[PDB]
Design a protein around this ligand. Structure first.
Ligand SMILES: [Mg+2]
Ligand SMILES: [Mg+2]
Ligand SMILES: [Mg+2]
Ligand SMILES: [Mg+2]
Ligand SMILES: [Mg+2]
Ligand SMILES: [Mg+2]
Ligand SMILES: [Zn+2]
Lengths: 182, 82, 149, 88, 56, 96, 116
RNA sequence: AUUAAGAGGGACGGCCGGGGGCAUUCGUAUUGCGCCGCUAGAGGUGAAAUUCUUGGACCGGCGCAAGACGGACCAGAGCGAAAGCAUUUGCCAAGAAUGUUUUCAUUAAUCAAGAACGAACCGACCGGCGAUGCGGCGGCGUUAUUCCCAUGACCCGCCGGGCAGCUUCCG
């Protein structure tokens, strides 16, 4: 978007430095308003361009530079979730989006700590980065809030799932009873 | 606001206002004399015409009605009247 | 302040202060009258007759040149319309909507627009009865309206 | 279409544009016009062609939006159908 | 052949340019008896003087 | 066209004011370059009364035939030979 | 020259599939999943399981003369995630370790346009 | 009786709009079916368990059928009395505003009763500044160009009626 043009301009020298370590080129096209990433002949790792594609997409979603390049490490993955199509009404969409962040950002931060993933809400997309198991949980909970089920249920559900994990016994046994019921 | 005298508006002020909002209403349309090519007979045409104007002598199409001022044909010569 | 539209339009004609005919006008009062008669014999409404005179013959206002309005001139010669022009145009619109509405059962909007047109027809009909233009027995009927116009 | 002893002989079957290139052109502050036609060639081949275009911002333009009205879009669309039809 | 083609093209262009330069001076500028000539070079579109347009 | 053809592919090309003759693989082809609006320009006839009209002309009709009508029939009959291989023999015997 | 193939890598969170076909994609050369190599349901989508899956396919292509591959990375798509699974990286990496030449890579994850 | 209201009604002019009705058409996704290739599993979870599979499940390819839906472009933009309205083309009727030196001449406003339709701080508080959508007027320059179809795109000034902001003034 246009509002992201300004930020990218000063932080472009840094990302080209980061990509040059893996010999992948990038270009910030001001006229077209586009970011383009392409490999070279010096590159030896085929999968880094797929990781390079993810980095430019996160920056277009206003994700900060420090968190954005973090996914270049193999241990970290990423997932962008589009929530605009869920609700036709704009007023309902705004209200439920505000429920997700919660008071003072508490519910967002509580989800961030439990999931051990960095989550940012911007426009009609929510960007999450972290371990693969974590990204699965974020998509389950974030999509659920748009379906008119309160976030506090899933956050409290995640906490109870966490406490049972430390317990070595009854791991095989089902957790349906222990999970809270309406 | 800038001070304006309601009794004596300047000529550029009253030309700029809406025709109904002046001190005295005055339309912005006018009548003109047109001379068609082919025969040099003179025809009087209203500026904001709503119907196609044909020469009496040679029956040539002079103007075409539009949303606002009528558009004249190419090669014609027009004179504002009065 | 349109009756059925919330917006308030201001587009209208603004007559000049001068009521005198221009010097360039080479047509006389008698000459204009026969042009009115010929246009009426062609089958043109008085509103349309004034438009033709304005566009081609430079007749800005028939009332200022001949001293009489167009409709009053036509009545004197005997070319009097059966029904008032505004009333006749309104009845003509109602028939066209009703004819379309018979072939389109689900057109709710045409049903709603038909009510507004009939409301203006009833209001204007009562006013003309007061002015004795119409006899005090004329009624507007949907079946009769087609035969009326 | 035919095999001639370890030589598969092929013919044109269709054409398509890549996903990334298609996504890149579709911008946010412009209007896109699309049309489709069904045209038969001289040798009997019947084709369906899809065309897409985007409005262009002028160099000296100051208005941020470059939007085309509905009738202009249809006029643009009508020309697109005629050109593809006549050229096949 | 090239010289004659160049020479004919070299001769042709100033005549177009001279007409354009003359037309731009004559655009607007009502003459005596106050006649103003309708041209394609104004900002108001005008009806072309062609038979096809007249029939339309 | 003749200058570029002989430089990029080494073909014998002769330039004429109406056509270009090109020798390739023992065959001689005559290349004519046409302009789309040229028949329209030939139809411009300014009338004495003061109106510019469009009327068909023998020169205008001839150019439309050589550049537009003739290629269509040549392409149309070429496809017909594909369905009916015996069309070529009948037509040539008819001319003979 | 190089004999080319098309390699389909479906990478779900539950399981990882590596599948190699010809250029037209109609004739199947070799297909190994994560379940064939590890005898546990926890580790079927684990990166180690995918690495074994890639190694078995890569050596199979060698005896057939196949030297280079085109790659189609695909996620579960649809209403579900559009992120490649954990097995995607290791199986991709192991294919290059065996000496298989890498052509073009492309994501063929089915992306819906109208939400259900 | 006169005028022809910055009262109202009607006609006329070119445009404009996810406004309404009838037909028509295209697009992926998903699901099911048919055939070809391959062979032990596929799915789901926190871990599992219901289920599907050697009469071939899942995956890869080709084609067919069905039900929804109309992204991105999509804006605090537009339209409609409100509820509401988004692929293409053809047809039917309607409407707002603008333009008008056209016509009638007080025909008007608000309203219990009654009728049509109906998802699932405060007050008509004079103004100003920027944009934005439509119509019109005027203009130094660029950019295309008109067999039919078509006469525009951009910049600047100005006039109205709208969707909204930031501000002031009065009770
Ligand atoms: Mg009006
Ligand atoms: Mg009035
Ligand atoms: Mg109208
Ligand atoms: Mg229309
Ligand atoms: Mg419409
Ligand atoms: Mg405008
Ligand atoms: Zn004449």
């Amino acid at each position: 978007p246009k509002y992201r043009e300004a930020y990218l301009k000063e932080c472009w020298p840094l990302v080209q430095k980061a990509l040059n370590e893996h010999h992948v080129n990038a270009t910030l096209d001001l006229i077209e308003g586009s970011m383009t990433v392409c490999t070279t002949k010096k590159t030896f790792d085929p999968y880094i361009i797929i990781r390079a594609r993810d980095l430019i997409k996160l920056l277009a979603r206003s994700v900060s530079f420090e968190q954005a390049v973090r996914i270049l490490q193999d241990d970290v993955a990423c997932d962008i979730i589009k929530i605009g199509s869920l609700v036709r009404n704009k007023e309902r969409f705004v209200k439920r989006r505000q429920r997700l962040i919660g008071p003072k950002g508490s519910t967002l931060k509580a989800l961030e700590l439990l999931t051990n993933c960095y989550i940012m809400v911007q426009g009609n997309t929510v960007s999450a980065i972290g371990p693969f198991s974590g990204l699965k949980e974020v998509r389950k909970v974030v999509l659920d809030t748009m379906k008119n089920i309160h976030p506090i249920y899933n956050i409290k559900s995640l906490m109870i799932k966490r406490e049972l994990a430390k317990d070595s016994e009854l791991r095989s046994q089902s957790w349906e009873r222990f999970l809270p019921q309406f | 606001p800038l001070a304006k005298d309601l009794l004596h508006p300047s000529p550029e002020e009253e030309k700029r206002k809406h025709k109904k909002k002046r001190l005295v209403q005055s339309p912005n349309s006018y009548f003109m004399d047109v001379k068609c090519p082919g025969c040099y007979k003179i025809t009087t045409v209203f500026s904001h015409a709503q119907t196609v104007v044909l020469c009496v002598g040679c029956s040539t199409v002079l103007c075409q009605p539009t949303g606002g001022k009528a558009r004249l044909t190419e090669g014609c010569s027009f004179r504002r009247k009065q | 302040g349109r009756m059925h539209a919330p917006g308030k339009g201001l587009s209208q004609s603004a007559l000049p202060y001068r009521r005198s005919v221009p010097t360039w006008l080479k047509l006389t009062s008698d000459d204009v009258k026969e042009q009115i008669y010929k246009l009426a014999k062609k089958g043109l409404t008085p509103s349309q007759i004034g438009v033709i005179l304005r566009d081609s013959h430079g007749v800005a206002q028939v009332r200022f040149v001949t001293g009489n309005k167009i409709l009053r001139i036509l009545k004197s010669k005997g070319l009097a319309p059966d029904l008032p022009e505004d009333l006749y145009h309104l009845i003509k619109k109602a028939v066209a909507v009703r004819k379309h509405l018979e072939r389109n059962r689900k057109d709710k909007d045409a049903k709603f627009r038909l009510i507004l047109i009939e409301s203006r027809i009833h209001r204007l009909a009562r006013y003309y009865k007061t002015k004795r233009v119409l006899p005090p027995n004329w009624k507007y009927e949907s079946s009769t309206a087609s035969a009326l116009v | 279409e035919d095999v001639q002893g370890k030589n598969c002989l092929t013919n044109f079957h269709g054409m398509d544009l890549t996903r990334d290139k298609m996504c890149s052109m579709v911008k946010k502050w412009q209007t896109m016009i699309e049309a489709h036609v069904d045209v038969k060639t001289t040798d009997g081949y019947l084709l369906r062609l899809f065309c897409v275009g985007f409005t262009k911002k002028r160099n000296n333009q100051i208005r941020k939006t470059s939007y085309a009205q509905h009738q202009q879009v249809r006029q643009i669309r009508k020309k697109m159908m005629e050109i593809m039809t006549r050229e096949v | 052949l090239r010289v004659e083609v160049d020479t004919f093209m070299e001769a042709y262009d100033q005549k177009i340019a001279e007409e354009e330069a003359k037309a731009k001076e004559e655009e607007g500028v009502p003459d005596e008896e106050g006649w103003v000539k309708v041209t394609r070079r104004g900002r108001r579109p005008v009806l072309p003087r062609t038979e096809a347009a007249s029939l339309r | 066209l003749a200058e570029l053809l002989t430089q990029q592919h080494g073909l014998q090309c002769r330039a004429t004011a109406t056509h270009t003759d090109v020798l390739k693989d023992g065959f001689v082809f005559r290349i004519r370059v046409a302009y789309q609006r040229e028949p329209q320009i030939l139809k411009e006839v300014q009338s004495p009364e003061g109106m510019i009209s469009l009327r068909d002309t023998a020169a205008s009709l001839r150019l439309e035939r050589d550049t537009r009508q003739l290629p269509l029939l040549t392409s149309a009959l070429h496809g017909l030979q594909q369905q009916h291989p015996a069309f070529s023999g009948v037509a040539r015997l008819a001319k003979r | 020259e190089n004999v080319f193939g098309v390699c389909h890598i479906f990478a779900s969170f539950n399981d990882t599939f590596v599948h190699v076909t010809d250029l037209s994609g109609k004739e199947t050369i070799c297909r190994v999943t994560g379940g064939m190599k590890v005898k546990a349901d926890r580790d079927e989508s684990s990166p180690y399981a995918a690495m074994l899956a890639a190694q078995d396919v890569a050596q199979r292509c060698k005896e057939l003369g196949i030297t280079a591959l085109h790659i189609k990375l695909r996620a579960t798509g649809g209403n579900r995630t559009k992120t490649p699974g954990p097995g995607a990286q290791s199986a991709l990496r192991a294919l290059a370790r065996s000496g298989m030449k890498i052509g073009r890579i492309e994501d063929v994850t089915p992306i819906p346009s109208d939400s259900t």
